[PDB]
RNA sequence: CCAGGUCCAGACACAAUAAGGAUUGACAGAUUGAGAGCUCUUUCUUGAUUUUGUGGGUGGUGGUGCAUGGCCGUUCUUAGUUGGUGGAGUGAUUUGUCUGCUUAAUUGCGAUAACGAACGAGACCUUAACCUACUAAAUAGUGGUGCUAGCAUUUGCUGGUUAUCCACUUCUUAGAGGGACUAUCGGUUUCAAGCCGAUGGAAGUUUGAGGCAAUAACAGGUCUGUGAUGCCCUUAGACGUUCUGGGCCGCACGCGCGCUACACUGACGGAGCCAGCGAGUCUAACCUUGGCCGAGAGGUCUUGGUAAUCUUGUGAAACUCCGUCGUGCUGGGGAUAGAGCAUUGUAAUUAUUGCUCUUCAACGAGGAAUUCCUAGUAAGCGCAAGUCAUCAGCUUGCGUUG
């Protein structure tokens, strides 16, 4: 257990951080990134009633002053609870201001944001309006290549929804060099959704893709023709012939044609 | 050994005299004492409403109402038949209270 | 004006067409009289439905009447 | 305030309860209020 | 906590009213019909009972632990509190091919012929069956083979709802003395169809 | 809503620069005006997160339009309508839906080219008032019996005692039933359904009240639902954020809802003293009993109640009696205003509110006109619940007199 000290103390500044919306962070609140251990003594603090504008100097504070790890260890258990919180609350089913800058600013360190924030979002219970925001958060900011080359390798691994779609869209919008590995994965996630006639067949071959599944086909043919070999070429062609879109699919097929193979 | 005096309260009245004659018939034959189900006062609960949301008309008002029913029954049981019974008598509409003092 | 309804007046000429001879002029009597001849749901229907039947075992003993 | 339909009117704050009176007409029976008298 | 008791009764029915929308909103293509919800001193157990149950728990419970984690951080919940529970189709109870099967792992395991059957006649009444019956016929570990049969609730035995409403599994467990019949029949419930003048003397 | 002060823009593409420096943070200071920022000198992390400039638009936590589905709010607020078959007419149309009579009613009778049948209304639900007959109680009350107190004693009265025991529900209450069905009589009516008067009844205007359908009409409102959807820019705009300070109450005034009065059925001082609808605190500080201090406002020290248990018997007010005042803008009235003391609020000035003293303004039953109302009802009177941090003259209920 905690000694009392610290309990009446971080009690005390947690009383205090009810109601700040400018000015300075005050100095134990301050010095809780440079202890080695943070767990504790955030607890005491009263987590879930935070102030927004303390949630996004946490999260500045909490992820410019610390390693991944504990960035990741902070979002999970903080910021990802608090996003969940500040949605499904909300009487519009809307985001704070200051809480979408906090989502925003997490994401300057890309690793920590996507294995503390994004993945645990879309396996417990990622529906439209938390994928569209975060979707929206994820198209703005800037991140390097790799870190989304992985999160969105962990995109394609994912069983299909439409939010996982529009995460999808968001990380292959960046037009960044991917490796080939990656675009060898596209591919394997293109083709979960084909007909086989051999007798192997799942939901996902069957069922009804939206627009935005050929939108994100013809996003991926256009971007990383030339990064694919020639049977993932013939592969690709076989799910336009067979799951092609009536205004998206002969686009598709045309700037599929147009690509060299590795 | 141990003087255990438990208090219903609900708003339907079938189903809290249902609970009540099955608690009397049920302590009455396994030969333990206690009390009869004291009968308190039903509340009645009472706010008032407008009858114009919107502001056309006159000013005039109703009533929406409750009824909210108490009743109970003292008892003296040992422990296992104290938790046997409060296994056995949840019902949806009656709640029921297990006290273990007397003070 | 307190006109009865037209389920009550249908029943109780019906229960005089069918069942004349055991009603009387006592109220009382009709109420348990139709509790074991007609299913009657409610105790202030077949209260209405007796005293019709009343009302009308005390006019048809005047006279004939149309039914 | 009233976390159904973002209402910043029309508010009851009895017991602690913070719906407006428009989203408490319909959930009243849902609640427990029903219409007697 | 410790609400006063007019105010408990009413946020109770809140309580009740927003996980009755929050359900049918949410899992109305998974055959809703109304849920209950029993207050232990343990915990809160949340009886879900929605007639397209398979749908429900997907691979490994994770719609379960996802429903479960809606119920704990709206309603300002510790972890561990809540218990969500499926009641309807896929209770492990109401298949005679799970129990059969359920029976042969204890018997192979080295429990009881009696304990095992116990708790596989309580699993199947607690899981809301209107009635079973367990058959084991084999050599029970001696030189002369017993033909021994246990019902409880409430069954039939011939008839067109025979053909729809009992299920039926035999499966024969291999022993280190010879052979057993496992045969299963589970009863479920029929409200769950849903798809002169003379003087005589003496 | 203003007067000012700050952040943070921009996803993406392209070109210079950049690791031999573009620049992100912990700071300590110079700061900085009103407050935080902002910037630059170190101690340090620095390390592409780029800085600057051009371009369709990303962003639609950018909104209005078009299609769908949908929920809520109104109305023909359906309370007489429609339809099927028939007849009549080339047709628009009509008969059903009517010469008469009756009803609250197009509710019925009767007659008949109309005859069926549906939804309207009638009707279904829910409430009230009487049950000394059941069936039943320390979270209600009464009476008897103990222990005990005070007084005349000649038997009594007034009490205590959340367990000393017993009985009961007469009152309180939870119920099961009863009862009312316009019962009976007399007028009136084709003497047909009904209406009115009298008797009995707890209840005899439909004893009194509202919810519920089916139907045709709503450009009504949004759902932060979906469809390469029409509109304008895509951003130096703050429709996003903050910081303080002011308001919404400012006053020739008109209109309206109310309070207090113009007085002696009354103002003031003592004594008598009667309610009910309620409500009340946890991981906090509600309703507050009781004792001390203070003129009071109130403060303080404790205790009870998470509630038929304690506040509370809410000992409320109007009222009742006994004294003061004599018709004199009076001792009626209490507007305005000043001073001091307290309480809540971070903060009381444009005075939050309460107390003490003083100031004692108009105003001698109100014109034209106008509001509401037929029995526990008008009116007077206070109390409780919501708005609640503090006050009501705001609203809803309750009770007293009537
Ligand atoms: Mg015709
Ligand atoms: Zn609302």
């Not at chain 1, 599944?213 to 043919?221: G, I, R």
Request: net charge positive; proline share 4%.
């Amino acid at each position: 257990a905690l000694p009392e000290k610290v309990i009446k103390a971080y009690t005390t500044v947690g009383s205090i951080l009810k109601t700040w919306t400018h000015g300075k962070l005050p100095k134990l609140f301050k010095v809780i990134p440079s202890l080695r251990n943070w767990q504790d003594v955030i607890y005491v603090t009263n987590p879930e009633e935070w102030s927004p504008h303390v949630v996004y100097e946490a999260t500045k504070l909490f992820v410019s002053n610390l390693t991944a790890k504990e960035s990741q260890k902070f979002i999970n258990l903080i910021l990802l609870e608090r996003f969940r919180d500040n949605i499904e609350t909300s009487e519009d089913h809307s985001l704070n201001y200051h809480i979408y800058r906090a989502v925003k600013k997490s994401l300057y360190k890309p690793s920590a944001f996507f294995k503390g924030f994004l993945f645990p979002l879309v396996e417990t219970g990622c529906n439209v309006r938390e994928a569209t925001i975060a979707g929206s958060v994820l198209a703005k900011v800037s991140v390097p290549a790799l870190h989304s080359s992985a999160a969105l390798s962990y995109l394609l691994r994912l069983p299909f929804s439409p939010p996982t779609t529009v995460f999808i869209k968001i990380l292959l919008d960046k037009k960044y060099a991917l490796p080939y590995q990656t675009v060898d994965d596209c591919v394997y996630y293109f083709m979960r959704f084909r007909i086989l006639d051999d007798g192997s067949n799942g939901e996902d071959a069957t069922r009804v893709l939206p627009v935005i599944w050929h939108k994100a086909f013809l996003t991926f043919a256009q971007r990383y023709k030339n990064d694919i070999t020639q049977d993932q070429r013939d592969f690709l062609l076989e799910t336009v012939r067979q799951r092609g879109h009536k205004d998206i699919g002969p686009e598709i097929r045309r700037e599929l044609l147009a690509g060299a193979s590795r | 050994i141990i003087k255990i005096r438990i208090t219903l309260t609900s708003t339907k009245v079938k189903q809290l005299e249902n609970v009540s004659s099955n608690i009397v018939k049920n302590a009455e034959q396994h030969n333990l004492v206690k009390k009869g189900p004291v009968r308190l006062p039903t509340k009645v609960l009472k706010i008032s409403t407008r009858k114009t949301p919107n502001g056309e008309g006159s000013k005039t008002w109703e009533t929406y109402e409750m009824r909210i029913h108490k009743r109970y029954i003292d008892l003296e049981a040992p422990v296992q038949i104290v938790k046997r019974i409060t296994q056995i008598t949840i019902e949806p509409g009656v709640d029921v209270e297990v006290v273990v003092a007397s003070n | 004006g307190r006109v009865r309804t037209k389920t009550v007046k249908r029943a109780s000429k019906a229960l005089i067409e069918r069942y004349y001879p055991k009603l009387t002029l006592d109220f009382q009597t009709n109420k348990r009289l139709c509790d074991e001849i007609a299913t009657i749901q409610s105790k202030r229907l077949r209260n209405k439905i007796a005293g019709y039947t009343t009302h009308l075992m005390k006019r048809i003993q005047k006279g004939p009447v149309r039914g | 305030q009233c976390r159904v339909c973002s209402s910043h009117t029309g508010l009851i704050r009895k017991y602690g309860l913070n719906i407006c009176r428009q989203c408490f007409r319909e959930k009243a029976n849902d609640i427990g209020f029903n219409k007697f008298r | 906590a410790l609400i006063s008791k007019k105010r408990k009764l009413v946020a109770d029915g809140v309580f009740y009213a927003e996980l009755n929308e929050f359900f049918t909103r949410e899992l109305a293509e998974e055959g809703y019909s109304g849920v209950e919800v029993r207050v232990t001193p343990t915990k809160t157990e949340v009886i879900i009972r929605a007639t397209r149950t398979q749908d429900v728990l997907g691979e490994n419970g994770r719609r379960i632990n996802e429903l479960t984690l809606l119920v704990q951080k709206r309603f300002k919940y510790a972890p561990g509190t809540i218990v969500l529970y499926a009641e309807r189709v896929q209770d492990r109870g109401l298949s005679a091919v799970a129990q059969a099967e359920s029976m042969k792992f204890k018997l192979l395991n080295g429990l009881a012929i009696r304990r095992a059957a116990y708790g596989v006649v309580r699993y199947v009444m607690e899981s809301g069956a209107k009635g079973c019956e367990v058959v084991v016929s084999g050599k029970l570990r001696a030189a002369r083979a017993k033909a021994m049969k246990f019902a409880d609730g409430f069954l039939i035995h011939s008839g067109q709802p025979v053909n729809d409403f009992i299920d039926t599994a035999t499966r024969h467990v291999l022993m280190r003395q010879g052979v057993l019949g496992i045969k299963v029949k589970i009863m479920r419930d029929p409200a769950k169809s849903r798809t002169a003048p003379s003087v005589k003397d003496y």
